[PDB]
């Protein structure tokens, strides 16, 4: 019963994106590419109002595959040579419905010496019958 019941739902949005550059000279580990993945808010709105911490599960080949970002812009800047499906989990700060999301995002790259990669994605979060304080956070972002 979509909007058939008297329920007040708030809807937020998160952005999964990444830019992938190659280097004309690979790094010390001989990695050719440097990519920066990020999770952002709706239209560049700061999401730290409902977003607590975020995590990027990189490939085990990467030093510290688990990148949690509690600081400013949720982004990981790492170097590699090959792309892969990178599961991103976004943590929220609340005591209600599950405060973690799981977005499967493909980290793709170009050949060394080819057009870079700039892919943005926007995912909606929908919360049925949330607490007003939580709405206040979802609105303030």
């Amino acid at each position: 019963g979509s909007h058939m019941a008297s329920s007040c739902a708030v809807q937020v949005k998160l952005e999964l994106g990444h830019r992938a550059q190659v280097r004309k000279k690979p790094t010390v580990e001989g990695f050719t590419h440097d990519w920066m993945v990020f999770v952002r808010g709706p239209e560049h709105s700061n999401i730290q109002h409902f977003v607590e911490k975020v995590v990027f599960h990189l490939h085990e080949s990467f030093p510290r595959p688990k990148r949690v970002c509690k600081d400013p812009p949720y982004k990981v800047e790492e170097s590699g040579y090959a792309g892969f499906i990178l599961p991103i989990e976004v943590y929220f700060k609340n005591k209600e419905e599950p405060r973690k999301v799981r977005f499967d995002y493909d980290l793709f790259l170009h050949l060394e010496g080819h057009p870079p990669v700039n892919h943005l994605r926007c995912e909606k979060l929908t919360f049925n019958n949330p607490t007003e304080d939580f709405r206040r956070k979802l609105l303030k972002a």
Binding site: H59, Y81, G83, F84, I85, F108, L109, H110
Partner: peptide, 13 residues
């Protein structure tokens, strides 16, 4: 397809 190399998380799973 036709892009940079790929190291999948699970080989043919």
């Amino acid at each position: 397809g036709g892009k940079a190399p790929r190291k999948q998380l699970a080989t043919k799973a």
